[PDB]
Amino acid sequence: NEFGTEGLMQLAAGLCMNSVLEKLSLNYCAITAEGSKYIQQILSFVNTNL
Amino acid sequence: EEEFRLKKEQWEIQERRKKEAARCILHFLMARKEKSKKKKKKKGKKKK
Amino acid sequence: MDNTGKLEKQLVTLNDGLPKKPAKEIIEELKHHLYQDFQKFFSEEKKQQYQNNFALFDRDNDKYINLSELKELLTSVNITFPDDELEELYNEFCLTSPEADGINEDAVFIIVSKKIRDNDKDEQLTQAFKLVEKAVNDELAKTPNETKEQEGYIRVEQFKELLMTLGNRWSEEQANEFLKDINPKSDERINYLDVVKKLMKR
Amino acid sequence: ERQELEEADRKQQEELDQIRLDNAIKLIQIEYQEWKDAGGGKKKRKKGKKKKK
After folding, report:
1. From the CB coordinates, do chains B and D have 3 or more pairs under 8 Å?
2. Which residues are paired to C103 by β-bridges?
3. C2 φψ region: left (φ > 0), alpha (ψ -120 to 50), beta (else)
């Protein structure tokens, strides 16, 4: 799914701090480097059960 | 000023009248009594 | 027949509803809801003000502030807190960032994001108990005899009747435990102000 | 009028004392209730690209 930065941000809208899943895969999606900032917000979180 | 002073002396007199009223007020509920028991919780959160 | 029993003492074993997903996100909900407070309760003006004030604080643009500069930011926003507890909170959040020389913005601000709800609990309790005092006065208006020596006492059983409804629903065991701890003098009542002092003092 | 001015000044002092007592009551309860709305964001670029020499 080549959604890119737009799609990754749309996911992060609630998933960036979502606390539900176990395994989330976005391989072969050409996620742009800039959008990685969103994932940067996911890891800096102290609440962690994924 | 004289009219207001007469009125405020009447105010003091009626204040002492109300103090006697209160004296008669501390006189109504000696022991009773009968256990308004069960429930009055519901106090809907909409407040003042 | 023949009274062949038989009651069972149902012990709720700790073998139900065990979370399945170990170690990346699933607690993300809690603080998220906490965030919604400042994702709800706060105007964005304070958000922007704090963004700019910290960026001024972030002299190295590293998003982080050390112990001295964290106390700097807390004081600049008019924070009056003892050294110790703030110190342990900062240490915990730095443990949450073992490889960072400080704490990140989100965890840094969570330090008093906790105290937000902490003090909100006391505020709601005080407001509810002032309303309780007003209700007691309303009841005593219909009751003439009760003299001014009763100003500050309404049935402790009533304390429990009201607790579950004001501010937040208090657990039945919660109220029972609190009443047992306070230890009323077998008069079926306590002093409301003394309880207020104890609860604002613990 | 000047004596009434002194009386009003004393009344204002009484009011300010009552407000100070209210301030003492409020100080603990209002000790930074509400520490605030997320900040620093998403710096990504490698901006430093200026003159060669």
Report:
1. no
2. C65
3. left
